Design a protein around this nucleic acid. Structure first.
Ligand SMILES: [K+]
Ligand SMILES: [Mg+2]
Ligand SMILES: [Mg+2]
Ligand SMILES: [Mg+2]
Ligand SMILES: [Mg+2]
Ligand SMILES: [Mg+2]
Ligand SMILES: [Mg+2]
Ligand SMILES: [Mg+2]
Ligand SMILES: [Mg+2]
Ligand code: NA
Ligand code: NA
Ligand code: NA
Ligand code: NA
Ligand code: NA
Ligand code: NA
Lengths: 46, 142, 122, 73, 163
RNA sequence: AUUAGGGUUCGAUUCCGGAGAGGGAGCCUGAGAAAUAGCUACCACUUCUACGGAGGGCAGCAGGCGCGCAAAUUGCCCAAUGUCAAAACAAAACGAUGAGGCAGCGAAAAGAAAUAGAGUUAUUUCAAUGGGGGAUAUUUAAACCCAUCCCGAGACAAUUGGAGGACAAGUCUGGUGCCAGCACCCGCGGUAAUUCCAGCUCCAAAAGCGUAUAUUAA
């Protein structure tokens, strides 16, 4: 059964990642995290 | 009850511990020079070999699948082992008479997962990492 | 507008000199204070006949700026300086011997003559 | 030490017995050592007696001590 | 080869890398004081631990002992100098109550924020890194500078700074 | 190194001691050697030649070849630390030193720290500059680096593993359909996959993060 090698990965549709604005790095990212959680988890739409 | 408690009985306690220490499978393997003699790698962490054939090993029940494996011959000691090609569709990077780098699977001799009797894994082919080619971060030489 | 302060002063009659640590303060400069300016000011403050007889070396500019520290020597005569000073220090100050040829060429020449005997040697 | 054997000519074997302490088990251990000593004709020690010996220069392949005193029984 | 310069480590990763109660408590401290990574918090945990074990060994095992009068006042002198302990309290038992926030207060980045020079802890960080702040006429660029209580009234702006 | 205590484990490697200079013997000189950048002989390798003959010993420093999963420049200098000695430095007039120093290569390991900040009605206003480029200069045996001063922003754009449980984080959306594959363990996939392949979002550590093999603790 060596014929079916990479059967799925060679047939999935091709999609491209979107372009998004960059995020702050270093201590400028931790403040972004602290701003959301404290001083008002991943919920998905139904 | 099961011990000697004399004040001048240190010789008996020393011999009791020395003899009973051989019942440890882990301790005896470390202290026996016959260890690493049956180990194909010879005690090292990695080894290089030449790919000679491609095989397909069935999965143990209750799992049904064909695991893509490769038979290689080591260079340092000229032994024969069976290795595993992990990622999806990665069999096309490996050809016969190719130099590869082989490492362990993670349990130090024991088999891993539903693959029966396989304890090695392919991590590099033709001097370039297998996962690097899988992510297309590099290209196959020649 | 720089100010020179001297600390740990000693008199060396054995080598005919005085050794001390020189500290320099300044408010703002276009970089670092040249060693010649400290030399000229050191001669005036200590009243030496010739400014070419005081040697300075090893200057470290402190972090933040506005301060340097080093070592200095004042010789009694110009002849004393030309006699007791290392060849590299006096080469910075102008009067020094020429640099000898490369050491590699000396080693090959010396080894070549080790096989000969009598004349044709050096 | 104690005289252990007097089967040679002007030579005896003495034995020293002591206890050795093993740190891990906090208990003692019986050990011994044997020395060859030169016995002068001034002394006539018997087996089991206690003697006092003193160090000297090498007198033979194994002898480095000399008998200086003998305590009866 | 033939080099005798020394070096050691100053922090230690925690056991159990996925405790929920520890993860959120550390996040409060990191954003409250403007720290960049969790390595800063783990560094303070190491020095605090070293203080405690010295006191506990010295506390009651040796009793009144020349090894207790010595380095029993040195630690108090050390603790009082930086402000990690109350002036009134002068027994070795009261150094065991030191906490992580107390040491984090006596930081150059924190002191500037509470002195009114900087509006926010993140603004204080950029000022120190820009050489706009000096202590006793000395430019300081290290936000981890533990300010001693004697120099508390000496911190001000820098002469060479535009401010 | 780890560990509450008791212990377990490593130590070829900077200081001290022992032994060796391809293998094995023998010896001269000398205060001191059974010396090897001294001698003599044999064995195994090996070089030049006009064929008569004569040579070699990098487990010194750089460099090569092989061996392997695995380890730098055929660089500069005696300026510092020392050794030797017929010897202090200068004056026609500079002792040697691959010991040693100091630059290159070098995410072993270890410290400090960038990737902005304050406001305005969501969208425009300020100030500050460090990477970088230069300097009468400083450093240095000469260099270098570093420090010090001055043309320069709001692409100079952070990654590595994960999201059923252990264990922090999706009942999100396509594709496949016990196939491909995932999975350290338990276990997912047989046409409605919380686990495969992708998109979005989220989580952990962060200039670091996974994997393999030994070891300590558990
Ligand atoms: K020298
Ligand atoms: Mg400035
Ligand atoms: Mg041992
Ligand atoms: Mg040695
Ligand atoms: Mg070499
Ligand atoms: Mg390496
Ligand atoms: Mg060297
Ligand atoms: Mg996914
Ligand atoms: Mg959870
Ligand atoms: Na050892
Ligand atoms: Na020797
Ligand atoms: Na040699
Ligand atoms: Na001379
Ligand atoms: Na340097
Ligand atoms: Na263990």
């Amino acid at each position: 059964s060596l014929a079916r090698a990479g059967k799925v990965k060679n047939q999935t549709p091709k999609v491209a990642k979107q372009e998004k604005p960059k995020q702050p790095r270093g201590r400028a990212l931790k403040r972004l995290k602290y701003t959301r959680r404290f001083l008002s988890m991943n919920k998905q739409p139904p | 009850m099961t011990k000697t408690n004399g004040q001048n009985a240190a010789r008996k306690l020393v011999r009791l511990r020395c003899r009973n220490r051989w019942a440890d499978k882990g301790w005896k393997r470390a202290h026996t020079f016959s260890a690493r003699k049956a180990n194909p790698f010879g005690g090292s962490s990695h080894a290089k070999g030449i790919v000679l054939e491609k095989i397909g090993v069935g999965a143990k029940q209750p799992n049904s699948a064909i695991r893509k494996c490769v038979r290689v011959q080591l260079i340092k000691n000229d032994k024969k082992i069976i290795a595993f090609v992990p990622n999806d569709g990665c069999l096309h990077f490996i050809e016969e008479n190719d130099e590869v780098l082989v490492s362990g699977f993670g349990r130090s001799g024991h088999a891993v997962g539903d693959i029966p009797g396989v304890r090695f894994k392919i991590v590099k082919v033709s001097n370039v990492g297998l996962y690097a080619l899988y992510r297309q971060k590099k290209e196959k030489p020649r | 507008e720089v100010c020179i302060r001297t600390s740990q002063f000693k008199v060396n009659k054995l080598l005919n000199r005085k050794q001390f640590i020189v500290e320099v303060n300044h408010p703002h400069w276009c970089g670092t204070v040249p060693t010649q300016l400290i030399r000229k000011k050191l001669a005036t403050l200590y009243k030496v006949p010739d400014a070419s007889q005081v040697s300075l070396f090893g200057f470290k500019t402190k972090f933040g700026g506005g301060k340097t520290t080093g070592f200095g020597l004042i010789y009694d005569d110009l002849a004393s300086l030309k006699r007791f000073e290392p060849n590299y220090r006096k080469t910075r100050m102008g009067f020094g011997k020429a640099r000898l040829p490369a050491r590699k060429s000396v080693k090959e020449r010396r080894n070549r003559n080790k096989k000969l005997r009598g004349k044709a040697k050096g | 030490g104690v005289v252990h054997s007097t089967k040679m000519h002007r030579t005896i074997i003495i034995r020293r017995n002591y206890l050795h302490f093993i740190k891990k088990y906090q208990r003692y251990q019986k050990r011994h050592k044997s020395l060859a000593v030169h016995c002068s004709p001034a002394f006539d020690p018997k087996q089991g007696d206690e003697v006092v010996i003193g160090q000297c220069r090498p007198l033979s392949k194994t002898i480095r001590y000399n008998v200086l005193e003998v305590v009866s029984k | 080869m033939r080099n005798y310069n020394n070096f050691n480590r100053v922090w230690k990763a925690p056991r159990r890398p996925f405790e929920k109660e520890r993860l959120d408590r550390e996040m409060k401290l990191c954003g409250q004081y403007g720290l960049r990574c969790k390595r800063e918090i783990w560094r303070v945990n190491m020095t605090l631990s070293k203080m405690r074990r010295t006191a506990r060994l010295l506390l009651t095992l040796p009793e009144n002992h020349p090894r207790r009068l010595l380095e029993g006042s040195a630690i108090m002198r050390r603790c009082h100098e930086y402000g990690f302990l109350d002036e009134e309290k002068d027994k070795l038992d009261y150094v065991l109550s030191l906490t992580v926030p107390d040491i984090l207060e006596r930081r150059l980045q924190t002191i500037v924020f509470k002195a009114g020079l900087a509006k926010s802890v993140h603004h204080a960080r950029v000022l120190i890194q820009q050489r706009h702040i000096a202590v006793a006429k000395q430019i300081v660029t290290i936000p981890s500078f533990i300010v001693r209580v004697s120099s508390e009234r000496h911190i001000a702006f820098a002469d060479a700074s535009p401010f």
